[PDB]
Design a protein around this ligand. Structure first.
Ligand code: CA
Ligand code: CA
Length: 181
């Protein structure tokens, strides 16, 4: 059908790259539509060992567009644009949205604690001797003390930006750590 050329018109890509991203979605999910459950199967294939189950759910929230639980290849191609054609700013927004799934739109050292636990349970790598054992607290503590501050108590995209912007190497490290995920 003309569902192809049409999608291309919306997205900002060439009929070539468009037909490419489409095939990938058809090769990784020759079913038609995608669902939360599937999203898990995807991250599972690229990361079988470990958990990734909790973080997988959070990932879904990142995608989608004010819709229900059923997604498609479109919203997926668009995201690709955010990652492909997107500077650190757009990324900061995408990463910030991930660190949040509950109501409201603010962050807190609490929600951050649960996030660290998820990544901690996912860390299935630990070969070779290692001294440091575990301490997901000191980290979330320095991050909140460095960013969180205003009376609002909770960190918002603003407070977040104010930090990641006037940052020196803090949020920069976060990106390096997120690069793996
Ligand atoms: Ca929140
Ligand atoms: Ca705050």
């Amino acid at each position: 059908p003309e569902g192809l050329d049409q999608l291309q018109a919306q997205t900002k890509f060439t009929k070539k790259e468009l037909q490419s991203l489409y095939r990938g979605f058809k090769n990784e999910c020759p079913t038609g539509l995608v669902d939360e459950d599937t999203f898990k199967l995807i991250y599972s294939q690229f990361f079988p060992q470990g958990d990734a189950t909790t973080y997988a759910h959070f990932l879904f929230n990142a995608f989608d567009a004010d819709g229900n639980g059923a997604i498609h290849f479109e919203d997926f191609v668009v995201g690709l644009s955010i990652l492909l054609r997107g500077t650190v700013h757009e990324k900061l927004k995408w990463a910030f949205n991930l660190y949040d799934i509950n109501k409201d739109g603010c962050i807190t050292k609490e929600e951050m604690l649960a996030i660290m636990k998820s990544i901690y349970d996912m860390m299935g790598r630990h070969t070779y001797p290692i001294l440091r054992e575990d301490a997901p607290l000191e980290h979330v503590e320095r991050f909140f003390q460095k960013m969180d501050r205003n009376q609002d108590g909770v960190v918002t995209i603003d407070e977040f930006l104010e930090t990641c912007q006037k940052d020196e190497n803090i949020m920069n490290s976060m990106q390096l750590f997120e690069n793996v995920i």
